[PDB]
Write an enzyme that holds these catalytic residues in place. Structure first.
Site, PDB file in Angstrom:
ATOM      1  N   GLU A   1       0.809  -1.214   0.000  1.00 39.60           N
ATOM      2  CA  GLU A   1       0.000   0.000   0.000  1.00 39.60           C
ATOM      3  C   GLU A   1       0.846   1.269   0.000  1.00 39.60           C
ATOM      4  O   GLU A   1       0.461   2.280  -0.588  1.00 39.60           O
ATOM      5  CB  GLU A   1      -0.948   0.001   1.199  1.00 39.60           C
ATOM      6  CG  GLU A   1      -2.238   0.761   0.950  1.00 39.60           C
ATOM      7  CD  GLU A   1      -3.447   0.038   1.505  1.00 39.60           C
ATOM      8  OE1 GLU A   1      -3.279  -0.763   2.447  1.00 39.60           O
ATOM      9  OE2 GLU A   1      -4.564   0.264   0.993  1.00 39.60           O
TER      10      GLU A   1
ATOM     11  N   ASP B   1      -5.691  12.392   2.309  1.00 42.68           N
ATOM     12  CA  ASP B   1      -6.278  11.287   1.563  1.00 42.68           C
ATOM     13  C   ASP B   1      -7.254  11.815   0.521  1.00 42.68           C
ATOM     14  O   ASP B   1      -7.368  13.026   0.328  1.00 42.68           O
ATOM     15  CB  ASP B   1      -6.975  10.304   2.506  1.00 42.68           C
ATOM     16  CG  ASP B   1      -7.905  10.991   3.485  1.00 42.68           C
ATOM     17  OD1 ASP B   1      -8.288  12.153   3.239  1.00 42.68           O
ATOM     18  OD2 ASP B   1      -8.259  10.364   4.505  1.00 42.68           O
TER      19      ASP B   1
END
Ligand SMILES: N#Cc1cc(Cl)c(F)c(-c2cc(-n3cccn3)ncn2)c1
Ligand SMILES: CCCCCCCC/C=C\CCCCCCCC(=O)O
Ligand SMILES: CCCCCCCC/C=C\CCCCCCCC(=O)O
Ligand SMILES: CCCCCCCC/C=C\CCCCCCCC(=O)O
Ligand SMILES: CCCCCCCC/C=C\CCCCCCCC(=O)O
Length: 409
Positions: free
Chosen positions: A121, A130
């Site tokens: 990830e 984000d």
């Protein structure tokens, strides 16, 4: 003669003796059991030598009420202080090395899953945002929900333990990731479709499942109904084949192929990713207590003041009592840290409970003993109760399984 005092009208010393006698027999029973069946997986999977130290400490714990209840001899004053001081140390300093090892093994477990998602990830050593736009750092670790960049730095500094200035390290990013891992496990255990699968898998394969969770979400991983059933029934090769047909495999093939491979072998091949040593440390921690006791024999020479009253002052009792307290504190710390570890038939859950109770018994001991006019009997009962709890919670469950449930083993 304890009987005489009972006839006089005082049932205290006769009760402490029976208590000790029933305790010696119990300890004698348990030890023999662990000797005969020392080859059974319930006894072999733990530390055989450390138990022999824990069981020995409990034995002397009961032998204490024979030093507190004895004919007035000089060496019995010595045996008292040396028995009330060392017996707990032999149990808690050998248990702390057990819980510390358990904690060290677990810490390394979380190390592997960290290196797993770091490759799969990614990682950022400084604050970012984000998709949702909230402030984030490390492997998708949410810091705060405020538009203030200053808010993220405060939450970060409080979270790390130093002034980070919005920049962390790989070890500090692992710390925050440990939190997200546990929070993910909480959600999985509260997900009816994901819980039975998580419980059946081993250590490595559980990491592969959490990996999928951190990619698609709990609600998404549940979409692999057929695949999850295959994994629960330990049909790895079928599960791999079934997962290689999913949109998840076709959308992110490089990552998925590695997660799938982990499911197959149960190893970390897809990723680049001591028993005698404990016996020396346990021995050391015991000697430290012995030193304190020997030193107090020199500073304050024991002397005779059924009941055997010794001239043992407060300092003669407080200093070893203090040292044991640290032994107990260290234990409880690592025990609570490993409370959910299912190794050795969920052995750790019994160890955690024992320390919890032991902490309560010992905290209650300080105002009760030093405020009592029947200190010897309160000593006898407190001492035996502490030894009994350790025996009843840690060893009886092991002894039960090994006698009443042979097949489960
Ligand atoms: N001062 C003091 C003090 C206070 C408490 Cl509450 C104790 F329980 C004991 C103790 C404990 C043991 N144990 C042996 C195995 C487990 N405990 N043996 C002897 N004394 C000493
Ligand atoms: C199993 C039951 C055995 C436990 C205890 C029985 C022994 C009690 C001995 C007390 C005797 C003391 C005395 O002789 O003064
Ligand atoms: C059987 C069990 C026997 C226990 C006997 C010990 C009782 C007396 C020891 C303490 C004392 O000397 O008063
Ligand atoms: C159990 C045996 C362990 C230790 C015994 C040693 C005690 C000797 C300390 C010296 C006493 C003194 O100086 O009066
Ligand atoms: C859970 C914690 C572990 C057990 C607590 C340890 C208890 C020993 C520590 C300190 C006790 C405090 C000092 C003793 C008070 C002196 C009383 C007095 O003599 O008047």
């Amino acid at each position: 003669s304890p009987v005489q005092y009972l006839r006089w009208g005082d049932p205290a010393p006769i009760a402490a003796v029976v208590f000790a006698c029933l305790g010696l027999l119990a300890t004698l029973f348990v030890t023999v059991v662990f000797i005969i069946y020392r080859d059974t997986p319930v006894v072999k999977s733990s530390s055989r030598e450390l138990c022999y130290i824990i069981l020995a400490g409990i034995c002397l714990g009961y032998l204490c009420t024979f030093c507190l209840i004895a004919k007035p001899k000089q060496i019995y004053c010595y045996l008292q202080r040396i028995g009330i001081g060392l017996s707990p140390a032999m149990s808690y300093s050998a248990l702390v090395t057990k819980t510390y090892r358990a904690a060290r093994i677990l810490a390394m477990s979380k190390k592997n899953i960290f290196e797993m998602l770091r490759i799969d990830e990614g990682l950022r050593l400084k604050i970012y945002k984000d998709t949702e736009g909230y402030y984030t750092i490390g492997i998708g670790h949410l810091l705060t929900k405020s538009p203030s960049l200053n808010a993220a730095k405060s939450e970060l500094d409080k979270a790390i333990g130093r002034n980070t200035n919005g920049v962390i390290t790989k070890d500090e990013a692992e710390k925050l990731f440990n939190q997200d891992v546990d929070a993910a496990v909480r959600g999985i255990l509260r997900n009816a479709k994901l819980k039975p699968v998580y419980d059946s898998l081993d250590a490595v394969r559980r990491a592969a499942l959490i990996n999928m969770v951190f990619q698609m979400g709990e609600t998404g991983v549940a979409g692999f109904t057929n695949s999850l059933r295959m994994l629960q029934q330990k049909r790895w090769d079928e599960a791999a084949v079934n997962l290689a047909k999913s949109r998840w495999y076709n959308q992110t093939p490089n990552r998925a192929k590695r997660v799938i491979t982990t499911f197959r072998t149960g190893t970390w091949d897809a990723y680049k990713i001591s028993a005698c040593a404990q016996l020396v440390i346990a021995f050391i921690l015991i000697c430290i207590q012995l030193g304190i006791i020997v030193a107090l024999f020199i500073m304050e020479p024991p002397d005779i003041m059924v009941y055997l009253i010794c001239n043992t002052t407060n300092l003669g009792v407080v200093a070893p009592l203090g040292y044991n307290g640290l032994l107990i504190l260290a234990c409880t710390f690592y025990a609570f840290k490993t409370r959910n570890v299912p190794a050795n038939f969920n052995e750790a859950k019994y160890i955690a409970f024992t320390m919890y109770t032991t902490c309560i018994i010992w905290l209650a001991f300080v105002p009760i003993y030093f405020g009592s006019n029947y200190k010897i009997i309160t000593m006898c009962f407190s001492v035996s109760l502490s030894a009994t709890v350790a025996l009843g919670c840690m060893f009886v469950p092991k002894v039960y399984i090994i006698l009443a449930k042979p097949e489960r083993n």
